[PDB]
């Protein structure tokens, strides 16, 4: 959709240098590479769990400090100023914390804004958003989520965990820090995009597991996002990482909050225990659940749609960082004022959202007055909608669950009245169902969310109902608007590939999808020609088919290989011309950041030399016939994580190039 | 490995007829095909659950009848004959039930022998074992498992559920019964191997879910076996089927055993509830668990190895059906005698294995004397080893879990003695760990088994230890011998593709793997030539590349398509010669069973005619370069479920053919 975004080189080039390295590795007499992958996955899990522990502990302590300071100060300030004076003071306190958070996000690292989940979804899809995996981004994300939660915004701390795990996985796998310019001479074999994308999948799964105490759910989330060929080894490693993440979080928290290692804190949010007779559903109740799904599908849409409009306003008028900070402060102040009006009219805004969700799930039937619960539902709905897109590190999972739990507990109260206090009409069960439905409507997650809800709930039997609502919420929701993360991905104009091609696509063939004419390089090519092709500012192609150079062959453009701009740049830098032989490490040294063609200097004498690309080109590029259905091209492209696909004639002559933007256009 | 086994045509041929059908389907103005897939998955789940209910209820009633008959008869027979007389009578009773079961297996349908899991694994791998999915096979399997369990063999009823679900999925999806020669004019679009293999995956997942009450575990089992490109839609449907299977089983059983629908019977085997303080592991205990894994890895090997030798004897000397029935009777009699000696020396053989496993898991610390528990462990180990390969419908999961639980509860008793009755040294927790370790050693299942154990246990926290043991059991076990299901697959000589190619395979290239010379067909081909190629009894190739026929092109064997023996047979039958136009249904009519080439009659005048294969050939065959690494060929072959892969020159001239046996040879 936009050229700002490049793509990962997931499909490794099995060139001659790579095969030489593999021969030496096999001769090594021991395959330590897999053991190193395992050690890296363990470290990823441990570090993600420790990040979750840090956030939880710091948030708890700072929230306690805010509560203590205001509890001490209210007497003094209300004695003379009055209630309104204390209202203003507390609102300014919240605004100040949110101000620091929004400053660090807008003025230092705007990528840190939000949960990070859309960015990680794009990364696992195969698109590289500029600063998603950086040390600065992780630091800003963690600090900002702490400051946002302490600042009393309608936000949650679960979402940033996925992004933090992804960044940790990308970082520690390399063995070196580009930001700190420190190289630890380890894990050099894993300085390639394939291994990095595997480790990031592990890290995202670990983040989900630490967030919700849902290991299998995290594994399934990573599998969904990747949408690749099945690798038993990688899935098992991801499972290992997720398990260690949840284990580390639980153990450390148990040692902290309690004085024993007994495991009672699987995740950052813990729903509770639902193993009771009152929380048992009958077949007669299955239709009822489905209906709530419809509701969650509609309300969710109304959420997303509203945000869309809000987002546009922010793109039009709140583009500036200073205005962004001011808007975040204003939202925080209005949230505080709504809370005060709430609290003084009633006789949860001060309390954590997770505790409110738990109480809604498990409190006895007569706990809540319907009127106040509905007021909270409406106000929190509109506040969460007005908070998602702010330049603050925050998530939307817990807010969505809270909204759903509230209106589900209202539905349960109404059912209990209508059914004369029946055991089957228990408000907490319907609160859980409503939480699932609202989260599904706002975010269209199906398998991973079902498994996550089952694990957090702790019951496997509740999965079948949770499934049916999550189904319906999607089916109804997709009727009106697209999902939140998708919506923001479209707005950012990222080239995003969906699970499958548009249904009416068997009509289309690669001939329509492919791009022509194609810029190709002869196997033995003049240095000047390569320099001119790469130096062109009209286009910034990063993959070039390598065609026959000998005059003997009949083929006009017979496909011999595919080479990349990065490899050509390395070769030109090292002046590897036919007129010290490179090793696969020499290419890995440039990684991740490759010098621009402008940097390389090629003298007119050197411009007349030649480059032989046979030793460095990918000898075997993936190829499709020109008369091939679009679904097949899409399936092959997505499954293998290809960056370039070559469309050829019957005679194996290059006729076109299919890339990510070629397949993303149709929708 | 052997030519007795063909392969599924999972990769659909997007020929002209298929595209015409898709255009008409799109013009239909409503896509009911997906809705029909959903309805079929729901029916699969319901029917699998009902099969599980039938087996459970019938087994319970018949076991009660046996217990009542013997309880009444022992007084009368022991009064005059003595204890030995009653011993003989009861042994003969068990032998008679096992005799009926073994007769129906050996003399009617030998495929029904065993769990069916190896056969379903092969089917999902892509190999077609002759009678795996047949009505007769399902009937025999269910009856035989009932008779084996009622006959007191060291067997379990869980394993046949996977096979039964697979057969149901294959059957009801077609809309017609070949065995009963009845056609219900429904589900005609799904009479192709792709849809059948998807439905069978759903059915296998449903079987696992009904067996262990583990929906997600069943989904993961199916995903592991398929090892294909990720399809969100298919995975979601499989999840739907598994959930409905467990729900139906639980609901029906609750209505039967209780008088209320309250859900308390998720699966055929139910471990129990482990949410207690005594069943809580510490970090200090993590190493201990690992050690037990090693034990489970070693013992499991000793199991498998022994069976191997036994299997050989049975292949050499107990090949005959009558001898097979006699051997099953002898094993049953020896099992009964061991039970009697057991029972009279002590003062579980009469009791169900599942109840014994549950009691071992949950009974209080002082329940079992170590001496008798060890005697049972050893005797049951050797009896289960001597029972797995019998011509009786049976499984090995529950026996393995029982063995592991027994020696794990011995390990826990020893730990309690050594640690002076510590709370951390609780025998039941170690019994669960030992069950997992022994099952892992005997069967090398890693992810699906971990998730299944977590769900059956009901605790997510126990997964991390259960993982570590299951890891170690595999790593140690693979050091000595291969897994049981694998071992039997090798012995049957089925061409089985593993998850990845041998590690030292980058050295090999398609040129080594591919088969030459290749038998190809010109696009316009003489009918006599096709008849001769298909009539050859030297080879039975089922896939033929279609090369250029026009003299104009330079290519000697330019690849234009791929056609199949079945399609050619249909065309010859309908005399579709250039010298009524077929519809995609006409090919589906022959499916599943295609007439042999011998059946078709072609007159000498017709032999001189021509066939144009363009409208029917697969216009776009998957292709790889001759200079391509074996890992890549293997990855593409396994991910896309290909039956044929064409290896071509730089000029796109056919040079070789890679099939399943080509890639399975290297090991
Ligand atoms: C108690 C909390 C635990 C905190 C853990 C923090 C670790 C994760 C982290 O916060 O990051 C680590 C930074 C890397 O950050 P980094 O700024 O250098 O980012 C580059 C680069 O910038 C690319 O960015 P780009 O693609 O945009 O060009 C990007 O892709 C690429 O993945 C990155 O390596 O240090 C390290 O490596 C860690 C040293 C590992 C060696 C010891 C192993 C034992 C564990
Ligand atoms: C309460 C217990 C529930 C019992 C359910 C039993 C249903 C499953 C079953 O036991 O099987 C059904 C048989 C098919 O057995 P079948 O012998 O004809 O086998 C052929 C053939 O033989 C191929 O065998 P092959 O490949 O070796 O040549 C094989 O692949 C291919 O899948 C098979 O269709 O009847 C049916 O279709 C069911 C009618 C469905 C229409 C109503 C839909 C509403 C539910
Ligand atoms: N060698 C080539 N010859 C002609 N067109 C090309 C070539 N490579 C890419 N294109 C086309 O140019 C357009 C822009 O491509 P771009 O330069 O972004 O490729 P890229 O950056 O390598 O792709 P990605 O960033 O997704 O890996 C695409 O629509 C693509 O079809
Ligand atoms: N058209 C062909 N020309 C030459 N050799 C072939 C051809 N097709 C298959 N072979 C080779 O013949 C051997 C036996 O093949 P077979 O006849 O079993 O193929 P098939 O039955 O179509 O394969 P499958 O049963 O696995 O689908 C294989 O090792 C294969 O490489
Ligand atoms: Cl974000
Ligand atoms: Cl959140
Ligand atoms: Cl979020
Ligand atoms: Cl079997
Ligand atoms: Cl079993
Ligand atoms: Cl089994
Ligand atoms: Mg680009
Ligand atoms: Mg064959």
Numbering used by the authors:
A (entry chain B), B (entry chain A): 85 to 431, 460 to 691, 700 to 787
Please quote the authors directly.
CLC-7 is a member of the CLC family of chloride (Cl-) channels and chloride (Cl-)/proton (H+) transporters and is expressed in the lysosome and the resorption lacuna of osteoclasts. In the membranes of these acidic compartments, CLC-7 uses the large pH gradient to catalyze the uptake of two Cl- ions for each H+ released. Unique among mammalian CLC transporters, CLC-7 requires a β-subunit, osteopetrosis-associated transmembrane protein 1 (OSTM1), for transport activity. In this study, we present structures of the lysosomal Cl-/H+ exchanger CLC-7 alone and in complex with its obligatory β-subunit OSTM1.
Reconstruction of these particle images with twofold symmetry imposed yielded a structure of dimeric ggCLC-7 at a resolution of 2.9 Å that enabled model building. Each protomer of dimeric ggCLC-7 contains a transmembrane domain composed of 18-transmembrane helices and a cytoplasmic domain composed of an N-terminal domain and two C-terminal cystathionine β-synthase (CBS) domains. The second constriction (1.1 Å minimum radius) is at the luminal entrance and is formed by the side chains of Lys242, Glu467 and the backbone of Gly241. Together the three constrictions yield an occluded state for the transporter, sealing off the external and central Cl--binding sites from the cytosol and the lysosomal lumen. In ggCLC-7, the Glugate (Glu243) adopts the ‘up’ conformation, where it participates in establishing one of the luminal constrictions. Within the Cl--conduction pathway, non-protein densities that we attributed to Cl- ions were resolved at the external, central and internal Cl--binding sites. In the ggCLC-7 structure, Gluin (Glu310) on helix αG is located more than 15 Å away from Glugate, where it extends into a solvent filled cavity between the transmembrane and cytosolic domains that is continuous with the cytosol. We modeled this non-protein density as a Mg2+-bound ATP based on its shape and a comparison with the ATP-bound structure of the isolated CBS domains of CLC-5. In particular, both ATP and Mg2+ directly interact with the N-terminal domain of CLC-7. The well-resolved head group allowed us to model the density as a phosphoinositol-3-phosphate (PI3P), which is a low-abundance constituent of lysosomal membranes. In contrast, the alternative conformation adopted by Phe510 in the ggCLC-7 structure widens the pathway sufficiently to allow water molecules to cross (1.4 Å minimum radius).
